[PDB]
Structure formats: C-alpha cells, structure tokens
C-alpha cells in the first residue's frame, strides 16, 4: 500500500492550492481517508478527515472553512483544497487511512510554502580540502549550496556512487531570507589523487540541476 | 488536549517509558523517523499492526497513558507522537512530541576548516565551514576567531540527526562575511570545545 | 526456439529508447509476450504484456505511462518504447512468452543503462605472478576504470578456461566499474607457456590482449 | 505480495525447500510459477500450475500450493543447483505479475582454507599516478573472511574494495578478490606491502608480502 501525494508548493499569502493524494494496494470506497499537516520544525496537527464513499466530512476550527476535503471513489484519489491561504498554514501535508480508529497508511506528504518571497536557485561552490585536510587519512570535502529558496534541496556525490561518510546537513534560514545548507563526505586522504570528486545538487522548485567539481587546493 | 515530555533519553538495549498526558482515553502512537513521514506504531497496547516490533509496546491507562520502548536499539532515533480522538469536538488530538537521544559512549569530534572558494570570492562573498563529525554527546562549542577576536555572531550552525550506525553527530559552522570584511583579516581559525577533548582543538588557515 | 533481445545501451537520463526482441522457432502470432527486468543485484521484475491479437496490453504501475509495448506479428518481433528513462530503470530487459500460467521462453536479455557519465574504456594492467603456499602461480589481469557495463575477459583466446576466476564488477565511488580475471596455473609452467588476457568493452569499442609475464 | 527467504542451504544428494508466501490481508487462488537463474544466465522455467515441469527439468523439482503460500522441493541436490530461485503468479487485486525476492540456494561443502596470493601495483599502473594491491582469496569456504592490509606495517581502511565471485558450479567453493587505492605518492612512501587473511578454515591469520 502506498499515497502519493502531489500539488504541494510556493504560494502567495491569500492563495490557493489543490493537493491530491493517489492511493495503490487497498479499497478506497472501503476506507476513510484523512489530512494532517506538520509545520517545520513543529508538531503534527490533524486537518480533515472523509468517510468510505463520502459519508461524513471533518475539519477543524483552527481553519476558519478555508480547506475542502473530497475523494473521487471511483478514482482512488483523495483532494484538499486551499483557499485564503496564509503564512501559517505553511507545513508538510500527509494523507492517511483510518482502519481501527487510528492512522495506520501515512503519505510521504508534500510541502506546502505560503510566503511573498520568490523563487531563487542556489549557488554551489566547492569547500575543497587541501592541506588543511590531515586527521590521519580522514580528509575531508564538500559543498556549499547558498542562497535558496524555497525548500527543499537534494545533493549525491558522484550521481550516487560515493555515500560512505555522506552528511548533509539540514537547512539554515540566514538572515537574507534565504536557505544555505553544506553537504560533506569524509574519504581516506591517499584517495584524494586516484578519484574526482563532484556533488550533484538538485533543486526542483527553481528547476536547478548542477554538477560542481570539487578539486584539492 | 494531550501533553508529551520534550525529551527522552535512553541507553542501548535498556527500556524507555514515554508518557502522554489527557484527560480521558484508545492512545494510538506513531514515530517520525528523521527527516520521514509519520509510521503507526500501536492502534492500542499490544495491537502493534504488521511488521513494528515487538519491542514497542503501549499502556492502557485510565486518563493518562505511557508507551514503553525495550531493547532500545539504534533505528529508535525519532519523535514519538501520540493521538487520541476527542469526540467532543470530532477532532483528532496530538502531543508535543518525544525526541529520543539514543546515549552512547563519548566520541571525540574530527574538526575540518574550509576556506572560501575562489568562485564564491568572485561573487562579492566570503564563506568558511568549520566541521564537526562523529562525535557524542551533540553539545559541544565552536568558536570563530579572526585574528584573535571572536566573531561568531556571523557564524551560524547546522547540526545533523543521530546517525543510527554509530549513533553519533556531525556539526557544521559557517562563518559569513563580504568580500572587504574578508580581505581585512589575516588569521582565520575555528576553536572547538567538547567533552571528548582534554584541549580545544583549533584548526587554522591565513588568507593566502 | 529462441529468442533475441536487442536496443540496449547506455543513454541519458529521461532519454528514449526502443527494444527489440526477435523470436525464431515458434508461432509468435500465437502467444502472448512479456517485457521483464532485472536491476543490477536485484529481483525480477515484471514490466509489460502484450496478447497475440495486440488487443490486451498491462503495464507495471511503477512505469507511470513511461513505457509502450507493441508487436510486429508480421515479422515475429515484440517492441517496447522506453520514455522519460530514469536511473531506476537501469537493468537487464528480457522477453518472455506467456505459455499456459507461466513465462515458458525467455531471452538472453539486453542491459540498458541510463546515467549522466561518459563513455570510459577500461585500462587493462597485468597481474604477474610473485612469491606460493599454494604449490600453484596464480596470474591474471585487472580491469579498471570502465563504463558502462559489461567488459568480458578471456585467457589465451579462449584456450585456457580451467581455474579461471572473473570477479563481479564492483562499482568504485569514483563513478567506474573494475574488475580482476586471475587464473591458477602449475608454478612449473611459469616459464614455458604463454599467458594472455583478451578484455573486450564492446561499449567504446575496446579490445586488448595483454600478456602477463613473471616480474 | 509475494514473500521469498533470502538464502538456504543445503547438503549433495540431500533435499532442501524453498517457500513463496503469498497474502490475503491481496488474495490468493492464484498459480504460481517456479524459475531457476544460474549467475550470469538468464531466468529458467522450473514449474508452472500444479507441479507440471517443461522439457528438460528432472524430476528432482516439484512444486506445491497450500492456501496462500507455495513452496519447491529439491531433492538430490548437486553443485550444479547454485542458483536463485524466484517465484511468480498473475495477481488480480493489481492484474499485474509479481515476483518474489528470491533465494539464493548454497549447497554445504567441507571447510576450505583459502590460498592467498598478493600482486604488486602494475608498472603501467604506477605510471598513470595510481597504486591498486590485489589481494587473492582461492577457492575457500565457508563464504565469510576477513582480508587486512598493511604497508610497512601500517595498517589500512576505507580505502579498498573486494568483489567475490559466485558459488563454484563444481567444488561449491568461492574466490574473493580485495583492491587497494593507492596513488604512486602513498604507495612509495612504503616500500613493502602485505595482506593478512583470516578464515574458519585456517588455523593462524596468513600474511603475504613482497620488497620493492
Ligand atoms: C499478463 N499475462 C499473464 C496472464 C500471464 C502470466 C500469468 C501469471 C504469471 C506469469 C504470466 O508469470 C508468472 O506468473
């Protein structure tokens, strides 16, 4: 069983956005169908809730009526739709099923951006190691994507054929508003001249795909 | 309507007791694996669905219920949640959240400078990333020093999830400054203090 | 009966490709054909079916509508029109026909691979022997720095077979493949007796006989 | 939907089984298939509906179905069987074909010691600015082993890789192969190399080295 959901993304405050969850290995029309949304860095917070063949609809108060939940039985789709959207509703939204009173299919849930900031690639540049590598074998290197917006962004090294001592690590809003995170592998140093190391940075929101070489200094 | 401790921690192989709170009660839990969507874990005690392990397991309790964890294990990192359905309101109720810091022995941290790269340095800007990999516990103390002076301030720090293989942290601090700022300055070091460490450790670099 | 798989190869990211299979010994307008994968270290994995008649076509869900089969009864042929190809399609792609409840005939398979990287022969360097415990020599040739997939080595043009070991391909983190063909040979005729290593990459048209000699 | 065990092993001329767990948490009232794969081969059909074999399967394969679970049965194993075995049936709750992960029969042998050997970095190797140290394992059983490096004596890791070949078709037995990446620099800051080997089947670690 898997729920795939889809339409989430960067929206202006006062929007609206339809979310659709598609579900796979189970009777739709036999099942309830609901939304719970988990802001960054936040706790998780129910939204809406459908029974089997539309029989009976749920919301909450904190949404003042702006979401609609509804399901196309016949196409094993669930729908939410946004209106009046504001800064808070900014989260990470899931699809789940109801079995035996609780959530037991949960979506990989998609996010949902509400904010007047714009869109904006990231620059990568090369944090390369050099002599100031050393700690006995264990130099390390990496990248810098700077200056993102919005979230989020994937990195691999070498299209995914180096992940030992891969860390990305999380992104930090800075003060410009924007998101900057570093991605950084730890290799044996003796490595350094026997292999070219490059990060492949993806960032879907502003179409960005960009392979930076990483060369010893 | 329902209340979580912030935090819990727990040793490798021991048992963990995470409570939650309410006002009457069936307490369903489920767990945010780091940087993954939510997963159930129990519909009620004992009714663990397919494939959670044994391991976890729930308390029917009155008002106030408890979710008890054995043989804690690495994987066991993530925020435990936990849900109930209020049908006062016909609305479904959740906690704060549990995070579970996994103890381990103490590691000391390798400690990596960066410099700046030439292309960054084109574009006006000047960034430095100190690195902090594998240690434990999380806390620890980086600190900028630009000819002797302290700078963090415009530093700022990212931390990473508790890696399950070796239950570990990586830290990384980036140290931004324009490229006048930059040019001003000779010495650029980064000073880290942390419990595995009998002295700071300080890596350096000059600009050139 | 036999089948044949051909079209495979290297090919970027969400490019297209088409796949043929050609089928000579049975009535081909009498069964219904099927299009299965197999990733590199990975299980088998349905991917398409298509009936006598072109009538009835299934495809995996996974495929999101990316691929096409299709059949040319008039000259025995099944095609498959791969589109969009991702790095999960990367795999070995055989037909099969549907006999009874079952796939009967199978293929010899095609490998597709779908990555960004470049074209890269191999560099054959010997392996000569030194020292052994073993009372034999062992001697052989290393594959290296190679893609894509696959490099195919024999001994003396296919004379010498007996205690030859041709290791698996390991995926380097530098992006190429390696790989090592040793062979154990009586340390006696170390001396006397010539050994060469044919590497053939048909993927950048690479062919080398390297001969190993003591040293 | 379609559940296979990972490995089993078995003993010559003995018999082994292998099982295919379906589920109806999906359905069952399905036929399920049998194929054998041989590395390096394409698929074989072993089985197909209810226990029938094509052409030149022997008799020593059989498969059976009970409820929603299916299982084979290998009777009078030899070598010659290393292979992996997959299962396959028509699910109606997808009207797609599943597969089952497969099982990668190993049939027992006695315990082999491995002979090591060790290979110096290529002439032509050194040139390009790069050292790679082969270290051979031959013909050894069972397949777990422990290959170490050293340099003057200076212990190594993460910065080698070893591929082992399959199940041998006749002795059952397996080769292992373990490669160093070393750049002319590193390799020539040490003159004499060594690899050590530690395996069931010997008694005390083995180490092999060369000067030059
Ligand atoms: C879409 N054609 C189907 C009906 C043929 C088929 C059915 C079952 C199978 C199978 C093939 O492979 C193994 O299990």
């Known amino acids: 069983v898997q729920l795939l959901e889809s339409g989430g993304g960067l929206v202006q405050p006062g929007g609206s956005l339809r979310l659709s969850c598609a579900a796979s290995?189970?009777?739709?029309?036999?099942?309830?169908m609901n939304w719970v949304r988990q802001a960054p860095g936040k706790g998780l917070e129910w939204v809406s809730s459908?029974?089997?063949?539309?029989?009976?609809?749920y919301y909450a108060d904190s949404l003042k009526g702006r979401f609609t939940i509804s399901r196309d039985n016949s196409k094993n789709t669930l729908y939410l739709q946004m209106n009046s959207l504001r800064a808070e509703d900014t989260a990470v939204y899931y699809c789940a099923r109801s079995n035996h009173g609780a959530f037991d299919i949960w979506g990989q849930g998609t996010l949902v951006t509400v904010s007047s900031a714009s869109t904006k690639g990231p620059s990568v540049f090369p944090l390369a190691p050099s002599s100031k590598s050393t700690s006995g074998g264990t130099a390390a290197l990496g990248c810098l994507v700077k200056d993102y917006f919005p979230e989020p962004v994937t990195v691999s090294w070498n299209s995914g054929a180096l992940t030992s001592g891969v860390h990305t690590f999380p992104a930090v809003l800075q003060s410009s508003g924007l998101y900057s995170l570093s991605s950084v592998v730890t290799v044996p140093s003796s490595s350094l001249g026997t292999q070219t190391y490059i990060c492949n940075v993806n960032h879907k929101p502003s179409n960005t795909k960009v392979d930076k070489k990483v060369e010893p200094k | 309507v329902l209340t979580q401790p912030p935090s819990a921690s727990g040793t490798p192989g021991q048992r963990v007791t995470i409570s939650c709170t309410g006002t009457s009660s069936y307490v369903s839990w489920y767990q945010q694996l780091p940087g993954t969507a939510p997963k159930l874990l129990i519909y009620?005690?004992?009714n663990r669905p397919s494939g959670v392990p044994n391991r976890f397991s729930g308390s029917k309790s009155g008002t106030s219920a408890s979710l008890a964890i054995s043989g804690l294990r690495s994987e066991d990192f993530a925020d435990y949640y936990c849900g109930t359905w209020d049908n006062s309101l016909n609305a479904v109720v959740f906690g704060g959240g549990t995070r579970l810091e996994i103890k381990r022995t103490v590691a000391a941290p390798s400690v990596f400078i960066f410099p700046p790269s030439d292309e960054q340095l084109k574009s006006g800007t000047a960034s430095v990333v100190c690195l902090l990999n594998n240690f434990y516990p999380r806390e620890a103390k980086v600190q900028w020093k630009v000819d002797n002076a302290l700078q963090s301030g415009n530093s700022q720090e990212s931390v990473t999830e508790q890696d399950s293989k070796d239950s570990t942290y990586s830290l990384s601090s980036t140290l931004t400054l324009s490229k006048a700022d930059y040019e001003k300055h000779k010495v650029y070091a980064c000073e880290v203090t942390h419990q595995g460490l009998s002295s700071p450790v300080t890596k350096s670099f000059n600009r050139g | 009966v036999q089948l044949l798989e051909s079209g495979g190869g290297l090919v970027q990211p969400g490019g297209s490709l088409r796949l043929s299979c050609?089928?000579?010994?049975?009535?081909?307008?009498?069964?219904?054909?099927?299009?299965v994968r197999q990733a590199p270290g990975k299980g088998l994995e349905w991917?398409?079916?298509?009936?006598?008649?072109?009538?009835?076509?299934?495809?995996?869900d996974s495929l999101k509508g990316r691929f096409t089969i299709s059949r040319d009864n008039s000259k025995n042929t099944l095609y498959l029109q791969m589109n969009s190809l991702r790095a999960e399609d990367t795999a070995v792609y055989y037909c099969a026909r549907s006999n009874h409840g079952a796939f009967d005939i199978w293929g010899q398979g095609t490998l597709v691979t779908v990555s960004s990287a470049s074209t890269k022969g191999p560099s054959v360097f010997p392996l000569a022997p030194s020292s052994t415990s073993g009372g034999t020599a062992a001697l052989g040739c290393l594959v290296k720095d190679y893609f894509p997939e696959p490099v195919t080595v024999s001994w003396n043009s296919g004379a010498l077979t007996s205690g030859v070991h041709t290791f698996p391909a390991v995926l380097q983190s530098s992006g190429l493949y390696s790989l090592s063909s040793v062979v154990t040979v009586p340390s006696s005729s170390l001396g006397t007796q010539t050994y060469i290593c044919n590497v053939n990459h048909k993927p950048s048209n690479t062919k080398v006989d390297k001969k190993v000699e003591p040293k | 939907v379609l559940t296979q065990p990972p490995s089993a092993s078995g003993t010559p001329g003995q018999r082994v089984t292998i099982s295919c767990t379906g589920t109806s948490s999906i359905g069952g009232y399905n036929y399920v298939s049998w194929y054998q794969q041989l590395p390096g081969t394409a698929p074989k059909l072993?089985?197909?509906?209810?226990?029938?074999?094509?052409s030149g399967v022997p008799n020593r394969f059989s498969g059976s179905k009970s409820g929603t679970s299916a299982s084979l049965a290998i009777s009078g194993l030899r070598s010659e069987d290393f292979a992996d075995y997959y299962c396959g049936t028509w699910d109606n709750s997808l009207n797609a074909v599943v597969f089952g992960g497969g099982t990668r029969l190993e049939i027992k042998r006695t315990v082999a010691a491995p002979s090591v050997f060790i290979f110096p970095p290529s002439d032509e190797q050194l040139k390009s600015g790069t050292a790679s140290v082969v270290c051979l394992l031959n013909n050894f059983y069972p397949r777990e082993a422990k290959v170490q490096w050293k340099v003057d004596n200076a212990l190594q890791s993460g910065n080698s890789q070893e591929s082992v070949t399959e199940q041998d078709s006749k002795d059952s037995t397996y080769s292992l192969s373990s490669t160093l990446t070393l750049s002319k620099a590193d390799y020539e800051k040490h003159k004499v190399y060594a690899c050590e080997v530690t395996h069931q089947g010997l008694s005390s670690p083995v180490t092999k080295s060369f000067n030059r």
């Open positions: 290995g189970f009777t739709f029309s036999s099942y309830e």
């Open positions: 009620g005690k004992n």
């Open positions: 459908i029974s089997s063949s539309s029989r009976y609809i």
